[PDB]
Every structure is written in C-alpha cells, then in structure tokens.
Design an enzyme around this catalytic site. Sequence first.
Site, PDB file in Angstrom:
ATOM      1  N   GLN A  64       3.738  -5.757  -4.540  1.00 32.77           N
ATOM      2  CA  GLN A  64       3.642  -4.554  -5.281  1.00 32.77           C
ATOM      3  C   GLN A  64       4.944  -3.772  -5.061  1.00 32.77           C
ATOM      4  O   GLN A  64       5.384  -3.569  -3.905  1.00 32.77           O
ATOM      5  CB  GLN A  64       2.419  -3.701  -4.875  1.00 32.77           C
ATOM      6  CG  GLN A  64       1.155  -4.483  -5.212  1.00 32.77           C
ATOM      7  CD  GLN A  64      -0.148  -3.833  -4.811  1.00 32.77           C
ATOM      8  OE1 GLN A  64      -1.204  -4.426  -5.085  1.00 32.77           O
ATOM      9  NE2 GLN A  64      -0.115  -2.610  -4.186  1.00 32.77           N
ATOM     10  N   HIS A 122       6.386  -0.441  -6.346  1.00 31.86           N
ATOM     11  CA  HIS A 122       5.715   0.618  -6.998  1.00 31.86           C
ATOM     12  C   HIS A 122       5.842   1.900  -6.210  1.00 31.86           C
ATOM     13  O   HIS A 122       6.710   1.990  -5.337  1.00 31.86           O
ATOM     14  CB  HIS A 122       4.218   0.258  -7.139  1.00 31.86           C
ATOM     15  CG  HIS A 122       3.496   0.131  -5.838  1.00 31.86           C
ATOM     16  ND1 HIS A 122       2.154   0.438  -5.726  1.00 31.86           N
ATOM     17  CD2 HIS A 122       3.889  -0.291  -4.611  1.00 31.86           C
ATOM     18  CE1 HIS A 122       1.762   0.205  -4.492  1.00 31.86           C
ATOM     19  NE2 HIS A 122       2.785  -0.230  -3.787  1.00 31.86           N
ATOM     20  N   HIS A 128      -7.973  -5.384   3.596  1.00 34.06           N
ATOM     21  CA  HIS A 128      -8.317  -6.540   2.729  1.00 34.06           C
ATOM     22  C   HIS A 128      -9.054  -7.632   3.510  1.00 34.06           C
ATOM     23  O   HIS A 128      -8.970  -8.828   3.169  1.00 34.06           O
ATOM     24  CB  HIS A 128      -7.055  -7.095   2.061  1.00 34.06           C
ATOM     25  CG  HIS A 128      -6.511  -6.232   0.957  1.00 34.06           C
ATOM     26  ND1 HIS A 128      -5.327  -6.530   0.303  1.00 34.06           N
ATOM     27  CD2 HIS A 128      -6.968  -5.087   0.401  1.00 34.06           C
ATOM     28  CE1 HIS A 128      -5.096  -5.596  -0.617  1.00 34.06           C
ATOM     29  NE2 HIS A 128      -6.075  -4.717  -0.578  1.00 34.06           N
ATOM     30  N   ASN A 133      -4.961  -8.623  -3.982  1.00 31.54           N
ATOM     31  CA  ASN A 133      -6.015  -7.635  -3.611  1.00 31.54           C
ATOM     32  C   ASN A 133      -7.377  -8.189  -4.028  1.00 31.54           C
ATOM     33  O   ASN A 133      -7.531  -8.679  -5.153  1.00 31.54           O
ATOM     34  CB  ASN A 133      -5.831  -6.267  -4.274  1.00 31.54           C
ATOM     35  CG  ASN A 133      -4.329  -5.909  -4.532  1.00 31.54           C
ATOM     36  OD1 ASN A 133      -3.632  -6.631  -5.224  1.00 31.54           O
ATOM     37  ND2 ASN A 133      -3.848  -4.841  -3.895  1.00 31.54           N
TER      38      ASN A 133
HETATM   39  C1  LIG Z   1      -6.323   3.426   0.526  1.00 28.28           C
HETATM   40  C2  LIG Z   1      -6.968   2.144  -0.029  1.00 28.28           C
HETATM   41  C3  LIG Z   1      -6.238   1.322  -0.890  1.00 28.28           C
HETATM   42  C4  LIG Z   1      -6.857   0.177  -1.461  1.00 28.28           C
HETATM   43  N1  LIG Z   1      -6.219  -0.484  -2.462  1.00 28.28           N
HETATM   44  C5  LIG Z   1      -6.850  -1.537  -3.061  1.00 28.28           C
HETATM   45  C6  LIG Z   1      -6.242  -2.136  -4.244  1.00 28.28           C
HETATM   46  O1  LIG Z   1      -5.246  -1.716  -4.797  1.00 28.28           O
HETATM   47  N2  LIG Z   1      -7.002  -3.183  -4.731  1.00 28.28           N
HETATM   48  C7  LIG Z   1      -8.091  -3.755  -4.162  1.00 28.28           C
HETATM   49  O2  LIG Z   1      -8.627  -4.746  -4.698  1.00 28.28           O
HETATM   50  N3  LIG Z   1      -8.641  -3.182  -3.086  1.00 28.28           N
HETATM   51  C8  LIG Z   1      -8.012  -2.076  -2.526  1.00 28.28           C
HETATM   52  N4  LIG Z   1      -8.609  -1.459  -1.488  1.00 28.28           N
HETATM   53  C9  LIG Z   1      -9.880  -2.022  -0.958  1.00 28.28           C
HETATM   54  C10 LIG Z   1     -11.079  -1.700  -1.791  1.00 28.28           C
HETATM   55  O3  LIG Z   1     -11.203  -0.273  -1.843  1.00 28.28           O
HETATM   56  C11 LIG Z   1     -12.316  -2.419  -1.194  1.00 28.28           C
HETATM   57  O4  LIG Z   1     -12.115  -3.799  -1.263  1.00 28.28           O
HETATM   58  C12 LIG Z   1     -13.560  -2.085  -1.976  1.00 28.28           C
HETATM   59  O5  LIG Z   1     -13.826  -0.699  -2.095  1.00 28.28           O
HETATM   60  C13 LIG Z   1     -14.755  -2.783  -1.297  1.00 28.28           C
HETATM   61  O6  LIG Z   1     -15.865  -2.477  -2.077  1.00 28.28           O
HETATM   62  P1  LIG Z   1     -17.364  -2.594  -1.469  1.00 28.28           P
HETATM   63  O7  LIG Z   1     -18.241  -1.979  -2.465  1.00 28.28           O
HETATM   64  O8  LIG Z   1     -17.630  -3.983  -0.972  1.00 28.28           O
HETATM   65  O9  LIG Z   1     -17.302  -1.759  -0.087  1.00 28.28           O
HETATM   66  P2  LIG Z   1     -16.903  -0.223   0.191  1.00 28.28           P
HETATM   67  O10 LIG Z   1     -16.028   0.402  -0.940  1.00 28.28           O
HETATM   68  O11 LIG Z   1     -16.376  -0.182   1.567  1.00 28.28           O
HETATM   69  O12 LIG Z   1     -18.286   0.567   0.050  1.00 28.28           O
HETATM   70  C14 LIG Z   1     -19.279   0.252   0.978  1.00 28.28           C
HETATM   71  C15 LIG Z   1     -20.209   1.405   1.201  1.00 28.28           C
HETATM   72  O13 LIG Z   1     -21.346   1.090   1.985  1.00 28.28           O
HETATM   73  C16 LIG Z   1     -21.597   2.235   2.787  1.00 28.28           C
HETATM   74  N5  LIG Z   1     -22.274   1.903   4.018  1.00 28.28           N
HETATM   75  C17 LIG Z   1     -21.628   1.326   5.036  1.00 28.28           C
HETATM   76  N6  LIG Z   1     -22.547   1.094   5.973  1.00 28.28           N
HETATM   77  C18 LIG Z   1     -23.767   1.491   5.549  1.00 28.28           C
HETATM   78  C19 LIG Z   1     -25.091   1.468   6.091  1.00 28.28           C
HETATM   79  N7  LIG Z   1     -25.391   0.958   7.279  1.00 28.28           N
HETATM   80  N8  LIG Z   1     -26.057   2.010   5.279  1.00 28.28           N
HETATM   81  C20 LIG Z   1     -25.846   2.510   4.037  1.00 28.28           C
HETATM   82  N9  LIG Z   1     -24.580   2.480   3.545  1.00 28.28           N
HETATM   83  C21 LIG Z   1     -23.606   1.991   4.294  1.00 28.28           C
HETATM   84  C22 LIG Z   1     -20.421   3.129   2.769  1.00 28.28           C
HETATM   85  O14 LIG Z   1     -20.655   4.438   3.142  1.00 28.28           O
HETATM   86  C23 LIG Z   1     -19.699   2.788   1.564  1.00 28.28           C
HETATM   87  O15 LIG Z   1     -19.625   3.782   0.603  1.00 28.28           O
HETATM   88  C24 LIG Z   1      -8.068  -0.250  -0.960  1.00 28.28           C
HETATM   89  C25 LIG Z   1      -8.762   0.553  -0.057  1.00 28.28           C
HETATM   90  C26 LIG Z   1      -8.180   1.733   0.465  1.00 28.28           C
HETATM   91  C27 LIG Z   1      -9.025   2.722   1.274  1.00 28.28           C
END
Ligand SMILES: Cc1cc2nc3c(=O)[nH]c(=O)nc-3n(C[C@H](O)[C@H](O)[C@H](O)COP(=O)(O)OP(=O)(O)OC[C@H]3O[C@@H](n4cnc5c(N)ncnc54)[C@H](O)[C@@H]3O)c2cc1C
Lengths: 52, 577, 577, 104
Positions: free
Chosen positions: B406, B408, B506, B551
């Site tokens: 990236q 950017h 990641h 990603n």
């Molecule tokens: C700054 C930043 C930059 C990123 N950039 C990218 C990018 O450009 N591209 C990319 O592909 N990915 C990127 N990512 C990663 C991406 O955000 C994650 O891969 C993605 O959000 C994962 O989605 P998910 O729904 O599996 O988990 P999460 O988004 O982590 O959501 C999981 C959720 O479960 C909840 N939870 C956890 N434990 C419990 C529990 N015991 N009971 C009830 N709820 C619970 C949380 O509170 C949370 O909201 C980035 C992340 C960050 C923070």
Amino acid sequence: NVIQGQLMSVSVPVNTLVVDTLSPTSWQASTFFVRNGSNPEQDPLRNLSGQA
Amino acid sequence: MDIKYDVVIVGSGPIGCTYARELVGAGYKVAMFDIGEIDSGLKIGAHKKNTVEYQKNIDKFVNVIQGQLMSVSVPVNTLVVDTLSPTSWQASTFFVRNGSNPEQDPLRNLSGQAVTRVVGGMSTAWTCATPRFDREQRPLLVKDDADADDAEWDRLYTKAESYFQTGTDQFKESIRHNLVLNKLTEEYKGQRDFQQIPLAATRRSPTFVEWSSANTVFDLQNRPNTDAPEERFNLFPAVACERVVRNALNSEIESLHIHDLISGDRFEIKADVYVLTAGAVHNTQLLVNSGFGQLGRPNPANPPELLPSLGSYITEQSLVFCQTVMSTELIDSVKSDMTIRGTPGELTYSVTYTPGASTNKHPDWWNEKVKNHMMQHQEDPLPIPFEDPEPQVTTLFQPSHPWHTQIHRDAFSYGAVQQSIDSRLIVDWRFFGRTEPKEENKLWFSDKITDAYNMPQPTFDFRFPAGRTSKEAEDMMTDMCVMSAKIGGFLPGSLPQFMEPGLVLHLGGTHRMGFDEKEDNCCVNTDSRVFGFKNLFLGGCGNIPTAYGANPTLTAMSLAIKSCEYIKQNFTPSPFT
Amino acid sequence: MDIKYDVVIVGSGPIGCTYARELVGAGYKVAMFDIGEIDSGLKIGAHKKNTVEYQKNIDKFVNVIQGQLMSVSVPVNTLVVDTLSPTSWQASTFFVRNGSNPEQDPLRNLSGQAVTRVVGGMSTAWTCATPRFDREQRPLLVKDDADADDAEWDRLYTKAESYFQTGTDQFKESIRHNLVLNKLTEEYKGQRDFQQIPLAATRRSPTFVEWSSANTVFDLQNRPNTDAPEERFNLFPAVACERVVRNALNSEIESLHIHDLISGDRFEIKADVYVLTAGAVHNTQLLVNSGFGQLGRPNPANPPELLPSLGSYITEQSLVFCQTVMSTELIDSVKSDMTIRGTPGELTYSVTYTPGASTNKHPDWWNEKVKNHMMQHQEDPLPIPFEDPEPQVTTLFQPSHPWHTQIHRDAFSYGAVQQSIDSRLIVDWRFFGRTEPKEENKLWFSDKITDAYNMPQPTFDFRFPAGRTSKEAEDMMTDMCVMSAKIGGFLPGSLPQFMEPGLVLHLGGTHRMGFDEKEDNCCVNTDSRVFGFKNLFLGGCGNIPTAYGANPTLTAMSLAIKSCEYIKQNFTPSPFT
Amino acid sequence: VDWRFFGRTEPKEENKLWFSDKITDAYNMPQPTFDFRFPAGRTSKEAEDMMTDMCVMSAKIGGFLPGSLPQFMEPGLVLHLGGTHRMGFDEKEDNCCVNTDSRV
Ligand SMILES: Cc1cc2nc3c(=O)[nH]c(=O)nc-3n(C[C@H](O)[C@H](O)[C@H](O)COP(=O)(O)OP(=O)(O)OC[C@H]3O[C@@H](n4cnc5c(N)ncnc54)[C@H](O)[C@@H]3O)c2cc1C
Ligand SMILES: Cc1cc2nc3c(=O)[nH]c(=O)nc-3n(C[C@H](O)[C@H](O)[C@H](O)COP(=O)(O)OP(=O)(O)OC[C@H]3O[C@@H](n4cnc5c(N)ncnc54)[C@H](O)[C@@H]3O)c2cc1C
C-alpha cells in the site's frame, strides 16, 4: 564529554529491554543472556547505577 | 429480549454483519450480541472517520484507532525506575502490575496485537483496503478442480465486494495518486502492474469519502421496522458472551451463556444456529472457555479431546513501513505543461496551458487544477492543489513479489519536526508479508490469569518462522527501499522499519478452515462449521489457514457468505407469526 | 427544517443545552445547530467516558480527548529538517504549510488552546469538576449589595448543580481518596480545608461512574416526543453557523446564516431570539464574521464601531502539573490496623483486624477491603484493592492560596517506563492560577487567512500579565511542590511543570460580561444580552470577566440560567400548532 | 542557573559493595556488585525535604527550565561514595577498617 568519556560504570545489571522490531532474518535471543559487560550478580533494584 | 431465536451471532463486526445481512434477509429470527457499545452516531456500527471533522483533519483519526485498541497480552514490565524519591514506595520485584500477563514470554509475543470492543468491531476504524487473494494466498474451497475453485471464489468475492462497496475509482482524479501511479507503472513496465488499492468506500464529494464499515454490510437497526417489516433482528450491545454449552455427545450446542454488563443479569440464550464472529482472538477464547481445545499452557503430552488444532498454526503478517518526501523531479513534473510568465506575487505573473493539446503530458482536468492552484495561491511553492486527495496505490501480491503493498496515506501522528514537511509531499509505504502456518505458533489461554472481562487471559507463543517467511520478510524490506526510492527519499523519523509484531491486526489461523480435521490440522470445514457440531459456525480471519499478505477481511467475508449458504440449506426459519 | 423558530441556539455544548433545557421546558419552539456531529452512542451529547471499555481502561480516554481537540492557532513551523535525501523536494523558506497561521506570533500564543466540534461539545470529554467561584473570582450580578449578590449566585449555582448532577460523595469510600484527603487535612489543620472535588457525576456501581455532560442537562432528542409531547425542539448537526444578520440600526438580529455541511446548501433561519453558545473562541469568531468588533490585526487608531471590547481582556489560567508516587509511610498506614501472621502464599498466612476497635486508625469499610485484598491476593505487595477508585481531592481557592487544586487521577498516557510503576501509587496534581484581565491580551481574526471551515483564522496575542498573575503562578508552582511532597515524591517523567499555555481550555473573557459597556469594558450585560441588541444573547466562559482559578463551566451555566430568566420575561412562545 | 542539593546518607551494615567470585571486570578483577538502598528513616525523609527545599529556594531566583525540572539523579551519579573501608577508633566497636592514622 570529557567527564562521560572517562567514567566507566561500576556495575551494570543484565539488560531486559525488549527489541521486537528486528527483521525476521536477524539473529535473536531466546533469553536475556549476559551480554555487553553486564553483571549478572547485580540486582537492578539494589544498585548504584550511576556509580562509575 | 426473548431468550429463543433462530440464529444468534456473537460480535457485530463486519463478519457478524455478513451473517446478519444474509440470514436476516432470508427470514431468520436473529439476535446479535456485542460486548461493546454503540459509538458511531445514528448509523450503528459505521466508520468513525466519516465525520466532517475527521475528513478535514485525517491525522487526528490515529487517536480514534488508539483509543479503541486494547493490547491482547502485555508482558510483565521490567523497566528500572531508579530516580524515585527515597520516600516513595517501591516493590523489591517486578511484580504482576497494571494488567500485565505473567504467562507471556516477552520474546515470543505479538506485542502489537490488540482487540476492539465496540459495535461494528474494527470496521469502525479500519483502512478499508479489500484486495482479493490470488491462488497462492487462498484456501481451497474445491479439491482437484482449479477452475471450479476459481469460479467459486469469484462468485463469493464479487458478492463480498458488493456488501463492502469495494471500488477502484474513488481517487482517480487525485493528482498525487496519478503522479505516483504513473511513475511506478513506468518504472516497472512489463514487470509489475499497479492500480488503485481496492477500497471499501464511496466518494460523496471532492473532499468527502464515505468509508465502508459493518454498517455498510448491515445497518444494525432492530427489525421489524418500517423499511423491513417482515424481518426480525435484535442487537444487544454491552453483552459479554461467555460460553457455548455443548451437549454430552459433542454434536450440538445447546445454549449461549451471556452476561449483560449494564444490568448485570445472566441468561442462557437458545437458538437453532450459533455463529461466533468475535474476532480471531475472542472466538478462540470463547471456544476454550466452553471446553474446546485446552485451557492453560499447551502440553503436548496431553492433547485435548475437542479441536486439537484450535489456537495453533496462528499467522500474523510481517509489516514494513516508511514514509517518503516526493522527489524534486516528480514535483516539477506536475507543472510540466505550464507556461510561467513573470515572478509570483507580482503584477503580471501568469500561468497558462492549452486545453486538449497533444504535447500536454497531463489531462485537462489535471492542468486546470494545477493552473488555478498556482495562480490563486502565488505564495505557495508547490504545484499540487491544497485539497488534492491522497495517493492510494498498490502492486498486488505475485510470486515474484510475494507481499501486499500500500502506497498511500492514512492517519498518522507526525512529530513536530515532521510537521515541518508539507503534507502534499508525503507518501506512506506499507508492505505486508505472508507467514507460514506452523503448529508451534500458538494463541493459548491462562488457567489462572484473567483479562479485564474476567475471561482466561490470552497468551501468545509466536515467532516468525525460519525459512521462507523470514527470507521473504527481509526481501520485502529491501523491495520497499528500492521501490520507494523511485518516488522520493525517506522522511526523517519514518525511516524503513519493521512494525511491532501484530500491530498490523491481520492475525489468522486461530480456528482455521480445512477439508478434514485431522489431515488439514483444522477446526472448521469449508461451510465454517465446527467439526462434529451440527449447529456451530465460526466467522472471521481465524478461519483463514493459509500464508497470506493481502488484507484478509474480504476473504473472511467471502467465507462467511458460503457459510450462510449452508445455513440456509440446513435450517428452517421460524414462521413469523 | 422549518425556517422560523422562537429561539435558535448555536452550539450543543453544556451551555447551549442549558438554554435548551430552560426554553424548551418553558414551551418555546427551539432549534439548535451544531457544526459537529452525533457520535456518543444512543444518548446524544453524552460523556464518551461512560462506556464499559473506558471505565475499565481510563487511560485510553486520553485518545478520545486528543482526537477531538483541534489547535486554535498554530504558528508557522521553523523546524529544520536537514537530513532529507538530496532527491527530495526541499523548501527554500519556511512557507505557510499544513494549516499554520502566519498571523500568529509563536511567542505570544496560547499554543494549547483547542476547540471541539461534536454534538455535546467539550462536555463529551471533560473532567466534570464543577466548583463554585468564591467572591474574589466571581463577577457581580447585584451592585452595592454583597448579600443580594451572594443570594443570587447561590440560587443560580444550586440550579446549575442540579442540571449537572454535581455531588461531593461519589468517591467517599475510596481508600486512595481518603488516604490523601486525611493526610492533607491533618497536614494543613487550621490552615486549609480539603474536600472531594465537586464532580458532575453519578456513581452507578463500585466500578462505574456515570459522568455528566450536555446530555445530562438536556437529552437533545427532537420534540415533540412520547415523553415530552407538548415540547418543541430540533437539533441540526453538521450545520456551520456563519453569521448573525444585523439590522442597519444595530439593534436587532434579523436572521442566522447557516451552511449545511452535508447537503452543502446555505440557508437563513429566522427566530425571535438568537443565542450564541459556540464556545469562547467560536462565539467571538461568529460575531466578528457578522460585523461586530474588528476584522484583522487590531489597530487602536481605528477602533471598531460595535463591541470594542470583544476579543480583548482574554484570560486563560496558568496550570502546573506533576504526578507523585505514594510514600512508603502512607502505603504502610493503609494496613496499620491489620494483624499479619504467617507468610504470604502459605496456609499460615493470616490477615485479620477487629471491626469496631477504637484503636483502629481506619473505618471498618476500609479495613474490610484491605483485609480481603491482602488475604485473597497474597502475591500482591500492596494493601490497596485493585479496583479501589481514584482520589478526587481539592482545597478550593482562597486568598492565601489563590489557585484551584485537583489532587486526583484522570486519563493519562503513561510512558512505558512510567507504566513500570503500579497505578495504585500514582496521584495527579493540577493547580490552576487566575489571570488578570488585560486589554492587550486579545483574540483576533485574520482578514486574509481562513481556518478549516473557511472562516476568519483565530489569532492570539497573549502573555501572562506581569504582577500578580505572574507572582501567583510561580507561588502556585511552589505550593504544588510543597503540598505534593506530603503524599509522595515526584514520578519521573511527570516532574513539576507549567503546561503549554491554553492546554487547560479554561479561556474566558472573549465576550465579557459587565454592567456598562464602556465603564466595564464589556460586551454583554448581566442577562448575557449583547449591548444594543434586543434579541441576541451569548452564553459560555467567554462571558466571564474576572480572574478565576476554578473550573469555569458551572459559573457559565449559572449565567445562562439567569439569561434564560430574562428571555422568559421578554419573549412569548408561539402557540403549539 | 544549576541547582544541586546533596543529602547525607546513614551508614548501614546492609548497604554493601562486594565482589563476585565468578564474574570479572575489564581488567580481569573480581566484578564489583552493589547491594544498596537509601536507608529508611532520617536519610529518606531528609532526601525528600531537600527536594522540597530546592523547589522553594530556586523559585526565589526563577522558574524551572523546561527539560531540567526538579528530579533525583540516578543513584551514585554524584560519585561521592564513602565508607567502603571506613575509619574508626576500634575495629570491632566502630565497625571499621582503618584507624585515625588511616592504618589498616
Ligand atoms: C486501524 C485498523 C486498520 C485496518 N485495516 C484493514 C484494511 O485495510 N483491510 C482489512 O481487510 N482489514 C483491516 N483491518 C482489520 C479488520 O478491521 C478486521 O479484519 C475485521 O474488522 C474483522 O472483522 P470481524 O467481524 O471478524 O471481527 P471484529 O471487527 O474484531 O469484530 C468482532 C466483535 O466481536 C466483539 N466481541 C469480542 N468478544 C466478544 C464476546 N465475548 N462477546 C460478545 N462480543 C464480543 C467485539 O466487541 C467486536 O465488535 C484493520 C483494523 C484496524 C483496527
Ligand atoms: C479534556 C477536557 C477537560 C475539561 N475539564 C473540565 C472540568 O473539569 N470542569 C469544567 O468546568 N470544564 C472543563 N473543561 C471545559 C469545558 O468542557 C467547557 O468549559 C464547556 O464544555 C464549555 O461549554 P460550551 O457549551 O460554552 O462550549 P463547548 O463545549 O465548546 O460547545 C460549543 C459547541 O458549539 C459548536 N460550534 C462551534 N462553532 C460553531 C459554529 N460556527 N456553528 C455551529 N456550532 C458551532 C461546537 O461544535 C460545540 O459542540 C474541560 C474540557 C476538556 C476538553
């Protein structure tokens, strides 16, 4: 600079600072081993670290 | 709050929201729980960067990111403070202090690994980069039929891209973007392709991009509602999901044990289908707390009865980073088509170009912007307009350059000295390596230490594998140094460096997918169904079993869509009475 | 989006919300505009600290603060970066870069002054300290009748305390609180009084404090609604209020010119009453943009026609700070009532005390917490419970110690070496000085430079006045050094220091209150009405004309209450239709 | 202006300079090792009182220079180490090594 150049620390404890941004290719320690003139006898919390 | 639903989903991140979108849409009575709370405004689970204030002041957004990210495992601190006053109390040892994890070997950690607890998950702060994985990075969904596997991935990715509103056009008229894109295209002519980073985002105006999030996938509004009168959905924030209850035969989940953090009440929630989308770390924790895998320090002389591969073969990407300050050559090239009469600030300074001419190096839209900037801002020494959007460039992972790239800008906390440098000059470089899955690389949970929510404390046992992973990582660093030099020299204070392990976020492989539990050392099958269990599914990057550089979110989403297909084929929605 | 209201309020901070609460409640048709957006969850304009995540990890809250604060005036950067690559584009001058303000003398700034643009204003992030001003700090509301003046202030403060839910008992059973409180009480017996800092907060459980905000004052829900079917209120976020339109006679405002930042449309809004609660900086900016005072660099040769005292006599408090690490003597005192036998981690270890014994130095509630902590956590070397709330101690401003004090904890970004020190040991010290109002200390606005919203760029001309202000500031530093030593020595990395001017965000006097425009060098009268104008009112800390050390919001709210009293007696609500 | 205030430290038997029987220094001599803390009681109270005294006295001349705020220096950076081979009248009664002629 003159003062610093001449003063040699009496007892430097083993260093436990973590460097975790080395490249994966670089040789890296599995322990905080006795390195760089450090004194493994020295409790870092019962030192006169500034003594030289 | 009933306690019986068709489907319960743990976590309201983008992957939970994929399950919600698919299953709410198919008529299931769905409940979703999140331990975090609503904090993106009226659009539940939306991107926090979509406020006018953050679009005016992007770098302030680093604070949002930092504010929500909580370190997974912090080793006991051994820093010596030996300039306390003699009157101040001091311990004689480096005791367990300040939420530190005494289980954690500070030298085998993913110290940068962190988790977010908020409605919408990490998608309230992510960078929105959503590339597809090529074959080399991608788990198989079809055995012995490469073209069928391709076809299936294409179908799923295309849908995932639609849910995320992924596009490659939102920056097409940025001068900086095109400057960098054109240069690298020329430098690697016939060697590498460059394009816009595929971004989950929609441009709304020349100064506003609506970045996608969980909200984009599913708006998270309770249903039925006026726009969805036949749908059924409830979101329950500030609810800690603690465990799933297995039947004695380990063939089905019987209930979900929850703790309402506001009321303090505990409930057992019943559903037909249980979906865990709590993230790669917390899905793992929930499963271990429920009697999957093994609690405590791994002991290979006592393998666990259920999901022996849970929490092994974890992967995290190597990340290298630098910033550059644009070359003089490139900056001058911006104004290459301009005729400049006079001295700036004085009476008959003129900057002109011929619209549509053939010796013009740049398109009219470009020269018009440049002309108007140079003329209306004669005090400014640069040809780039002040509101020019940032570059968003990539050369995607290939066998000959097996890293994601990236090139950017994103949110960054510049030092005061770095703020000396005009922001129009600066470009961020982030290259992301793939990590080989190895059994010894583990996420485990303490049987004694507990985290902030009184759950078993996560502990890493991680090193980047020797061999390909480490060689590639170093080759990737060199590549960044080589490639970035074509654009400008390093910005002091942002010199080429590896980032703290896991800061990338990641992490994959914690509950990894495969065809066969034993042969493929895995926890879920290709429907994301937990082996042996009729009605338990896991979603997220923890499913991805491969070494990947790109990603992962879009890939996880694609897996989730396939999982939902299985659910729709195997479970009947309750009649809506 | 009617175009006609009874009352329009610019700003949805706690002051704007005071006007809302009073006037909505009194049956006025009210519209409120804020340039910022809704982003505190379902409770509009609520305190961002009231999530379970931040109650568990308070120090992360610093990020929320930093993420919303935008520096008011940043001088041109003259830092030399001389290690760029020779290929990078390099400036020959320190040109106007990165939103810096070339009008700003770097040596006469309030470099720490910042503004927040979000629904709820700064009250989404504030520390909630709401002391009253004693007479010496307090402007007069009644002339030649100190008793009447006192009674009026008492009446107003009491209502303001009710709106904010101010109390002094939310930390009453903290061990750390009482340890500090009791020691300082003893050390200053007969000399100074100590108490809990008055805090706008309600304790909800042993580990949850619901901090007050704008939302506490008025919930910001549109009305009519089910709970308020006869009230009329609309909030319009993401609306930049640009100008109030003066009649040619300068006796009335005829409309408010707004810019919808989402649609991009401009409108004129008509109201009977116009209230500016945009903050001490932006109220001034709005007035200057509307033709009050003077655009550009002040020139005493060319005084402005309207409100010549606007933007002069500005005050900002000096602030000194340190942290301490609790003395051994005080920590040992925590367990003074304990009988300790055996040795930790063994069967033999016994920590006991006698409830009610007269020789006990501490109450039973304290000893019970200490005993349980020590018995249940034998590996921990400290007698303070892990979840013990923080100290919240003050000695309020008095003539012999003319500064406000806070001896407490709030969110702080500890460096890694400082994170070596157990948090239970750490206390924050913040002493706030009063600043004499001086005509030469000015907030003015560029006639050339514009800010991020295309409005005239704020510029400070400020120094702490010589004489009393300066003497007291230094005396205050010394008093902090002396007083803090009674509790413990300084924490390395948090040594006694003056904070950057304005970081305190207690700016006053920019649109100051007085009895007579000329005689009292002021802009509003004691009803907060702009001199000469029938229907224009200003609310906020900018009204406060005195030198004050205590936190100003409660005082500003008190003035707003009084203003509303005048409004209620001089304008009639439209009939509810 | 630089401000340096120096406290006095109570001699205590437990505060020791000793030499390793295994580790050696750069000249192949037994490696010196400290076991030192500032004594509780008078030493520590006075140290803190001294800090306060500096804060109070310095303010009469001017405010602190940023980056040189009031602080304790690293233990021993002062290089005023004493008592390692201490003088007294009687070896046993005065816990000492040399007499008043500095004779061992
Ligand atoms: C700054 C930043 C930059 C990123 N950039 C990218 C990018 O450009 N591209 C990319 O592909 N990915 C990127 N990512 C990663 C991406 O955000 C994650 O891969 C993605 O959000 C994962 O989605 P998910 O729904 O599996 O988990 P999460 O988004 O982590 O959501 C999981 C959720 O479960 C909840 N939870 C956890 N434990 C419990 C529990 N015991 N009971 C009830 N709820 C619970 C949380 O509170 C949370 O909201 C980035 C992340 C960050 C923070
Ligand atoms: C970290 C922090 C700690 C603090 N601690 C305390 C404390 O302990 N005690 C205390 O008394 N005070 C403290 N304060 C100060 C306190 O928060 C303010 O005094 C108070 O919020 C001022 O209220 P207000 O309504 O006048 O202005 P604000 O809270 O500033 O609200 C003004 C609003 O108007 C808006 N606005 C600005 N310009 C325009 C425009 N052109 N058009 C439309 N809207 C506009 C904003 O977006 C904003 O929401 C603290 C502040 C911060 C940030």
